[PDB]
């Protein structure tokens, strides 16, 4: 007997002896849940590490050309004491208008000599065609003058020429948390 | 075996996929910049080995796993496939027999030559070639191929050289 | 209290009694890793079983027609002592030129009377449209004169007519390992 | 009778071809740093003791010398502040910058040229110079790149 | 004040007579490997640190030098990439290739000549050069050959 092997009246049964047959391991069923917008995951930063983010408005891009923009930080972390601060894993993603002309991509590498050449070498690349319009520079830039980054632009290409402020781009960046966040200021100056 | 209520998490470009290297076996890579390719034809470059490991000392080394991915301008002209085989007599013949092959229509445009070359002289590679084909013709430097290989550490980074002979 | 149920000052809380509600079992998250070319899997053969492989160059195929080719083994295993050898699971896959005309498929069955008819009956089928251009004849041909196979051709169809040597095809085949592999030869002949 | 590097320290070397020069005058050349380490990432690494030596054609002019110092305003004056110097007249055509730079941004040196003087004017690619530099080995060193790009 | 070899390492040496040369020019010579080790068997052996020095007639021209590198396309350029060099002007007329080749096919070197330059042109067999090379001792070393042939 085995599965629902419960009937009525007699009914013998025999099998055969050999070297088994079925697969060695057995099955497990599953059910991929359908996820909606934003349900994703915004992994938390790490130890004593802050994640400073902010965006930069786009520049009128052309046909199939690709522009660049030395990225600069905000006044807060723009302190010589914080400039020489260390960074962690970091990502870039981009918010853009709904009515978009063609599909396009974007990345970031050391102040490239050749602007288009960037895409031939960057670790990750925010692609529009992809479901995830963003790139993860995990350990890619871990450790670096929180100023170093300045000399190092970001690259963006477009299939169809396009306007400026036509799209922003955020940069969630891991970096050691400063000390300002806490304590006030010396009353005695 | 009750079903497992699971949930595929979204993967964003350059995420995870950390690729640990083997012990003692150090991985070193670089790249050769494409030379203009015609439409549908497939070029091939001998192994653009780096001088860093040209010394017969290390050139007489061995390998194992070997990656190969590529960077192409956003203005990528259609699609292209790439790979590597034994100084293939026929150019296109290489694609008819490599263990792996990076393609532009693949989520991950790269090829993993898993052990397929394990135990081969580091020099043993130069008698190899890298083959790349393109849908429509295209320029040179238009694409870069990245030979990511692992092998071993020698006896030099270890130290400098003769002060006074 | 439960999740982050740590606040300030008082703030009571009560629920309701019924017949529960939520699903019976609970969730598990995952992350499908992105695999590249060749990372796949080349399952190892089995006990005392060798996997002899080799390829056969193509024949100029026509429009939508499908050719065939009595497959023959290599001299080594072409011994009457090894001819009457047993086989295991076996697969066929194919390497072909990059610049390909249309998509096409291929399989293998007993020296078919009708060449096209093969595709209506073979266990597996190397399809080009598929991500896996190969077929697995697991147990499909397990057990058989390592010669039997001879009488039994292989079939290939093409959407667009095409040249010869236009493509090869390998046959990784499981079969009992012979004895030559080891010991040398009787010095005394 | 050999030599050794340091703990967790790599010695990256390479050469730079000479640009022809005039006699008695001394040229300079910002550093041709190796791309592999041009990443602000490791470009901001720690260096150790470092040395420079030079291979040059046999058939070469009068005995000349060469060193390295901060982006020196005076090409010739760089030899008065040089820590060590590769002299041709010496039996040792090289200079040891031990602990002279021990502990500095791998990208620091960039803002710091190399100086070479010559008795008789001389051709380009007429002589090379190698730079055996101690620096902490970085990360990736032993693990591939995420295929997912 | 002496020197030592390595563990299970033999130091096979021998010399090669110079072929007359022209002044200022520099010749080359693939390696005259010793037959005893020309057997692909040990020819595929591991080498260690190795040195070259040179005995030459007393009565000899202007101070000249010599080294060794991969089959160099440019005879003269081999001296810019040379690891160490035997200079005559130096008190040490020899070059130490310690760990420079440490670990290489005993048959590798073959595809690698030796370079020599001279101030004044000079005769053949006018100077020899010895090669003290570290390499793992092979097998037979201590046992006869089967008489049964
Ligand atoms: Mg700094
Ligand atoms: Mg039979
Ligand atoms: Mg003196």
Complete DSSP assignment for A129-178: SSSS-EEEETTTS-S--TTGGGSS-EEEEESS-B-TTSB--EEEEEEE--
CA C8-C13-C17 angle, to 5 degrees, is 160
- From B110, which residue of chain C is nearest by alpha-carbon distance? C36
Beta-sheet strand order (sheet of C134-137): C49-52, C170-176, C87-93, C134-137
CA–CA gap between residue E66 and residue E85 (Å, rounded) = 6
Judge whether D21 and D27 are in contact, CB under 8 Å.
yes
Spatial separation of the C-alpha atoms in residues B117 and B115, rounded to whole Å:
5
Q: Which helix (H) or strand (E) holds D11?
A: strand D9-12
Residue C159 in contact with residue C101, Cβ under 8 Å? yes
| Spatial contact of D43 and D37, defined as CB atoms under 8 Å apart | yes
Q: Do the Cβ atoms of A126 and A106 come closer than 8 Å?
A: yes
Residues of chain C found within 8 Å of residue B67, distances taken between Cβ atoms:
36
Q: Least CB-CB distance to A144: which of D41, D139, D148?
A: D41
Contact A149, A73 (CB under 8 A): yes
- Per the structure block, which two tokens stand in for D14? 């390479």
**How many residue pairs from chains C and D have C-beta atoms closer than 8 A?**
5
Experimental method for this entry? X-ray
Instruction: Please state, as a whole number, how many other Cβ atoms lie within 10 Å of the Cβ of residue D62.
Output: 12
**DSSP per-residue letters across A49-83:** EEEE--B-----B-SS-EEE------TTT-SHHHH
Q: Are B63 and B120 in contact (CB under 8 A)?
A: yes
Q: What is the DSSP string of D78-134?
A: HHHH-SS-EESSSSS-EEEETTTSSS-BTTTTTS--EEEE-SS-B-TTSB--EEEEE
CB D65 within 8 A of CB D88: yes
Exposed / middle / buried, residue D48 (Cβ in 10 Å: 0-12, 13-18, 19+): buried
Which tokens in the block code for residue A136? 């993860």
Q: Does B91 touch chain C (CB under 8 A)?
A: no
Please name every residue paired with A134 in a beta bridge, in sequence order, or none if there are none. Answer: A93
**Cβ–Cβ < 8 Å for E48, E102:** yes
Q: Cβ contact (<8 Å) for C98 and B92?
A: yes
Closest CB to D57 among E3, E80, E98: E80
Calpha distance E53→E11 (Å, rounded) = 14
| Sign of the dihedral defined by the CA atoms of residues D97, D100, D103, D109, in that order | negative
> How far apart are alpha carbons B132 and B127 in whole angstroms?
17
Residue B44 has, within 13 A of its CA and on its CB side, a CA count of 21
Tokens of A26: 């057995």
Q: Compute how many other C-beta atoms are within 10 angstroms of the C-beta atom of residue D120.
A: 13
Strands (E), A69-125: 87-93, 104-108
Q: How far apart are CA D8 and CA D47, in angstroms?
A: 11
Assess E24–D contact: CB distance below 8 Å, yes or no: yes
Task: Check if the beta carbon of residue A143 is closer than 8 Å to that of residue D140.
Answer: no
Alpha carbons E24 and D60: distance in angstroms, whole number: 9
Count Cβ neighbours within 10 Å for each residue of E46-80 and write b for 16 or more, e otherwise.
Answer: bbbbbbbbbebeeebbeebbbbbbbebeebbbbbb
In eight-state DSSP terms, residue B21 is P
By the CB < 8 Å criterion, does D59 face chain A?
no
E29 beta partners: E114
User: How is residue D28 written in tokens?
Assistant: 């300079």
Contacts of A164 (CB under 8 A, 6+ apart): A57, A58, A59, A60, A61
What residues are neighbours of ligand 2 (ion), with CB under 5 Å? C 145
Q: Specify whether the CB–CB gap between E47 and E106 falls below 8 A.
A: yes
Q: What angle do CA C31, C33, C34 make, to 5 degrees?
A: 140
Please report residues of E whose CB lies closer than 8 A to that of D127: 80
The partner residue sitting opposite D3, judged by closest CB among B108, B157, B161, is: B161
Structural tokens at position C178: 């012979």
What is the resolution of the experimental data for this entry, in Å?
3.4
Nearest in space to B50 (alpha carbons), one of B42, B38, B41, B58? B58
Q: In whole angstroms, give the CA distance from residue C12 to residue A119.
A: 57
Hey, what are B28's tokens?
A: 């070193």
According to CATH, the superfamily of the domain at B1-165 is: Satellite virus coat domain (2.60.120.220)
Neighbours of E130 (CB within 10 A): 15
Q: Å from C35 to nearest chain D CA?
A: 8
At B28 the three-state DSSP class reads: strand
Distance between CA atoms of C17 and C120, rounded to whole angstroms?
A: 61
Strand residue runs (E) in chain C: 28-30, 49-52, 66-68, 87-93, 104-108, 126-127, 134-137, 154-158, 170-176
* In contact, B14 and B121? CB cutoff 8 Å: no
- Residue from the list A124, A143, A148 with its beta carbon closest to the beta carbon of D149: A124
Two tokens at E6? 């390595």
CATH class of the domain defined by E1-149: mainly beta
Q: Give CA–CA dist E29/E65, Å, rounded.
A: 15
Identify the DSSP state of D141: G
* Residue A142 CB partners (closer than 8 Å, separation 6+): A87, A88, A89, A174, D41, D139
Closest D-chain CA to E120: D59
Strand A30-32 to strand B4-8: parallel, antiparallel, or no bridges (unpaired)?
A: parallel
Say how many CA atoms lie within 13 Å of D94 toward its Cβ.
23
- What is the rounded CA–CA span in Å between residue D56 and residue D9? 28
User: What's the rounded Cα separation, in Å, for the pair B5 and A171?
Assistant: 34
Q: Give which of A138, A140, A147 to mutate to test D binding, by max D Cβ within 10 Å.
A: A140
Q: What is the DSSP letter of E22?
A: -
C158's tokens = 């093409």
Compute the distance between CA of residue E110 and CA of residue B43 in angstroms, rounded to an integer: 33
C35 and D CB contact within 8 Å: yes
Task: Judge contact between B31 and A154, C-beta under 8 A.
Answer: no
* Distance (Å) from the alpha carbon of D147 to chain C's nearest alpha carbon: 7
Dist. CA C110 → ligand 1 center (Å): 73
CB-based contact C84:C150 (threshold 8 Å): no
CB D23 within 8 A of CB D121: yes
The domain limits of chain A are 38-189
Backbone angles phi, psi at A95, to 5 degrees: -100, 135
Q: Which of B49, B71, B59 is nearest to B146 (CA)?
A: B71
Residues 6 or more apart in contact with residue C181 via CB below 8 angstroms: C50
* The two structure tokens encoding residue C40: 């796949």
CB neighbour class for D41 (10 Å; exposed up to 12, middle 13-18, buried from 19) = buried
Which is it for the CA torsion C57, C60, C64, C67, positive or negative?
A: negative
Q: Which of E81, E90, E88 is nearest to E65 (CA)?
A: E88
The answer to whether A152 and A110 have CB atoms below 8 angstroms apart is yes
CB C167 within 8 A of CB B96: yes
Q: Which residues contact A126 (CB under 8 A, 6 or more apart)?
A: A92, A93, A94, A105, A106, A107, A133, A134, A135, A169, B13
Residues, chain D, total? 149
Ligand 2 centroid–CA C153 distance in Å is 18
Ligand closest to the CA atom of residue D46: 1
A touches D, CB cut-off 8 Å, minimum 3 pairs:
yes
As a dihedral over the C-alpha atoms of residue D66, residue E50, residue D12, residue A88, rounded to 10 degrees, the angle is: -160
Note the residue count of chain E: 149
Round to whole Å and give the CA distance between E31 and E107: 10
Cα E28 to chain centroid distance, Å, stands at 11
Size of chain B, expressed as the number of residues it contains = 165
Indicate the SS3 state at residue C90: strand
- In words, the CATH class of domain A38-189 is mainly beta
């Amino acid at each position: 007997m085995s599965t629902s092997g419960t009937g009525k009246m007699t009914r013998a049964q025999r099998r055969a002896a050999a070297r088994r047959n079925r697969w060695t391991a057995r099955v497990q069923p599953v059910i991929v849940e359908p996820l909606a917008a934003g349900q994703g995951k915004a992994i938390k930063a790490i130890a004593g590490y802050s994640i400073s983010k902010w965006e930069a408005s786009s520049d009128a891009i052309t046909a199939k050309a690709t522009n660049a923009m030395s990225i600069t930080l905000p006044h807060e972390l723009s302190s010589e004491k914080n400039k020489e601060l260390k960074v962690g894993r970091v990502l870039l993603w981009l918010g853009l208008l709904p009515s978009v002309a063609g599909r396009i991509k974007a990345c970031v590498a050391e102040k490239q000599a050749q602007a288009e050449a960037a895409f031939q070498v960057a670790l990750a690349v925010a692609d529009s065609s992809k479901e995830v319009v963003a790139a993860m520079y995990t350990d890619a830039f871990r450790g670096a003058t929180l100023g170093d980054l300045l000399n190092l632009q970001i690259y963006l290409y477009a299939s169809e020429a396009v306007p400026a402020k036509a799209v922003v781009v955020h940069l969630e960046v891991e970096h050691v948390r400063p000390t300002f966040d806490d304590f006030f200021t010396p009353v005695y100056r």
